A paper describes a structure:
The final step in the pathway is catalyzed by a 2-epimerase, which utilizes UDP-2,3-diacetamido-2,3-dideoxy-d-glucuronic acid as its substrate. The focus of this investigation is on the ORF WP_011172736, which we demonstrate encodes for a 2-epimerase. We have also demonstrated that the T. thermophilus enzyme is allosterically regulated by UDP-GlcNAc. Whereas the sugar 2-epimerases that function on UDP-GlcNAc have been the focus of past biochemical and structural analyses, this is the first detailed investigation of a 2-epimerase that specifically utilizes UDP-2,3-diacetamido-2,3-dideoxy-d-glucuronic acid as its substrate.
The next structure solved in this investigation was that of the WT enzyme crystallized in the presence of its substrate, UDP-GlcNAc3NAcA at pH 5.0 (structures 2 and 3). The model was refined at 1.8 Å resolution with an overall R-factor of 18.2%. The α-carbons for the two subunits superimpose with an RMSD of 0.8 Å. As observed for other 2-epimerases, there is a significant closure of the gap between the N- and C-terminal domains upon UDP-sugar binding as highlighted in Figure 5. The uracil ring is positioned into the active site by the backbone amide and carbonyl oxygen of Val 265 and a water molecule. Glu 290 lies within hydrogen bonding distance to the ribosyl oxygens. The pyrophosphoryl moiety is surrounded by the side chains of Arg 12, His 208, and Ser 284. The pyranosyl moiety is anchored into the active site by the side chains of Gln 14, Lys 17, Asp 98, Glu 120, and Trp 307. In both subunits A and B, there is a chloride ion located within ∼3.2 Å of the side chain of Arg 12.
Author numbering:
A (entry chain A): 2 to 361
B (entry chain B): 1 to 41, 47 to 363
Write the structure that this text describes.
Amino acid sequence: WVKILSVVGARPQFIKAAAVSRVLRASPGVREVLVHTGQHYDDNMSQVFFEELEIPDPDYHLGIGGGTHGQNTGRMLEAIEGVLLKEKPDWVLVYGDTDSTLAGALAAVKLHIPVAHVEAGLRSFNRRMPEEINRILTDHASDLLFAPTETAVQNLLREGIPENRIHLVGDVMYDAALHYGAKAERKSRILERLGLQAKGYVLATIHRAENTDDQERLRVILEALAEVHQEVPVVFPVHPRTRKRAEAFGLGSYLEKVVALEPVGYLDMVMLEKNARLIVTDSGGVQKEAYFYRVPCVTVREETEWVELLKAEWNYLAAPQNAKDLALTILHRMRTKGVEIDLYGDGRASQKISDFLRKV
Amino acid sequence: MWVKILSVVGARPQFIKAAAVSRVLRASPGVREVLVHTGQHSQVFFEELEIPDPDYHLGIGGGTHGQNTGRMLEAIEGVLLKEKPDWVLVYGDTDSTLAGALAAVKLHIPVAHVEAGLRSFNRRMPEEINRILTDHASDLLFAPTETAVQNLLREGIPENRIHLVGDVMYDAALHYGAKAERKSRILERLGLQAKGYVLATIHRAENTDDQERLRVILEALAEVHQEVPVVFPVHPRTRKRAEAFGLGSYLEKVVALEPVGYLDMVMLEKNARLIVTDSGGVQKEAYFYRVPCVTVREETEWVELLKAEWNYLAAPQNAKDLALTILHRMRTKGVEIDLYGDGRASQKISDFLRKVGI
Ligand SMILES: CC(=O)N[C@@H]1[C@@H](OP(=O)(O)OP(=O)(O)OC[C@H]2O[C@@H](n3ccc(=O)[nH]c3=O)[C@H](O)[C@@H]2O)O[C@H](C(=O)O)[C@@H](O)[C@@H]1NC(C)=O
Ligand SMILES: CC(=O)N[C@@H]1[C@@H](OP(=O)(O)OP(=O)(O)OC[C@H]2O[C@@H](n3ccc(=O)[nH]c3=O)[C@H](O)[C@@H]2O)O[C@H](C(=O)O)[C@@H](O)[C@@H]1NC(C)=O
Ligand SMILES: [Cl-]
Ligand SMILES: [Cl-]
Ligand SMILES: [Cl-]
């Protein structure tokens, strides 16, 4: 048998790990160990993902979070190593691009434990972004690089990573949407709770530091969504950090002018995404999900790593410079669509991953 | 024009590199330096380098990679938040190096890597990962060799961030040569004459943490000693391992010493017939003095020394074979060639740090 240990720190990593774990559980000589590093350690940011997505309780919860980059990363590196020394996994899988991701990779490679990066080779080319540093360092530390796009493959080849370590497997978050979609239909009643008609609202999520730590950007965003809301209802599950910033800068009243919610579980999120007329976000996962449901998307950033979405016209960049401009862009984009194209694979990225963790 | 340049150093070879750089930075009064020592607070060997005492001793060491690295990352960041330097300099390829780079980059403090782009292409070595990741985290890459330059370019690091400045350890050797000649009495003390001995240092974990591999080395040196005396300043950790494994009697069969200071090291190296080492710095220094070298490893990053035939790899598989290799190479010389720059790597580094821009 082979032991495959997964390190997960945050909501989007739990969702990626859910897809992979589902395939590895069904595999003959594979034992899974799951380490939760403690970054997201809430109900609506963590536990709801474990229950709804049928993820077995983590074997370890490290309880680390809320410090500086150096504190969080340093403590995680030591604590993850401690677990690796006990468990002696044959593979460590790390996901996405947070400090957890880097800490796991760095803990493993120094113990000569093979590392594979799920969602490898994404680049913003903005080296000041902490996650840009994280994915670069993770990718160079890894033994296997599971890229979701051709752009990701090209990015890894450009940095001298050898072709035989890189596999274009598609996106496990597509696997997740495809596999949990029926379940979301059979359990979520969020549209009824909120009194929404299918295709009678816009859905917004905003959590990037660039957008929430800069008062003028966050004011543009919140004023824009209030304007949009007068035309078409805006539903907004608000990230807790985003809520705290809006309150801190005196912008809380804008949340009261839309249908602002606390963060929702994945099943409700699927139902909201599926039924939205348009999605406005700065989330990586959410902009891909918009495309999964063929809902037009606006990404409130100067760039995205998911460039194929822009090229296929499913997604559109709108930097938050002016509230009225952003509102008008949102309104205009909601009656657009992109081209016919199949991105991110067949929904079996996870069994491709599993197969490679046998063969290599 | 007032800029603060903070240097992160772990062990001996990093102090020697940082000393070379700091001797040049001291010539710019608008440059304030801060020196952060990641280990504990000997103070003589320290002073031969003409460096002020460290501003900080974080006192981290003796654990696993994850412990040492994780503790250092958090402690270095703490200092950076206090000191708010304009530049962080990291040196070489240890866990201290990577911890300093990681601490800085996430605070948006520019990092320069002294000794950038070296590659073994074997990730069994922790230092390989360390230097790859440090390089990809760095704003300025100070490469010692053309090979290092080509390694950095192949990994997609842009040309305008890479500078071939040569090796600060050649600067150091050039700077301290005369003082060593004037002040060192080690040959007199040991009873050796020029070209009458072989010098050995061994400190790599892979060579000292396996009983039978360390036995191969110590037995080889005992055999060599029967033909030509072997002078062996033993790294303290090498001696601890040797004692723990029950191999200490082998140290009595050569001229085993405690670690020596830099000036005495210059004198030993310069006057040796052959140097046998697993040190990166000593490999180069053997070449500086045109003394043949045998590297007790499966690879070296300093590949120019192999091509110029000044160095030769002898993995420690068999005591007899390693001894014979050592004795055969003692009668060799490499080709005349100018590696590692003009002794002014440190000046080039300082020039780049001071003009790069905010
Ligand atoms: C630093 C950064 O922002 N890195 C990116 C970051 O992802 P994301 O931005 O997508 O974070 P999120 O938006 O918090 O979660 C979305 C999910 O929550 C669900 N979601 C959303 C809201 C909600 O209320 N309920 C939900 O279930 C949605 O349905 C989605 O399934 O972290 C990822 C990771 O480390 O794995 C990186 O892969 C990633 N990098 C890229 C390039 O996409
Ligand atoms: C992991 C590893 O072994 N990395 C390498 C490691 O250096 P080295 O192997 O040279 O360590 P050392 O041999 O302990 O010191 C030599 C000096 O001590 C003097 N030395 C020596 C013995 C003595 O008794 N007295 C002395 O004065 C000698 O005269 C020398 O000047 O750490 C360096 C660093 O991080 O900066 C890396 O750049 C380097 N990687 C390469 C590629 O060379
Ligand atoms: Cl969010
Ligand atoms: Cl289609
Ligand atoms: Cl040594």
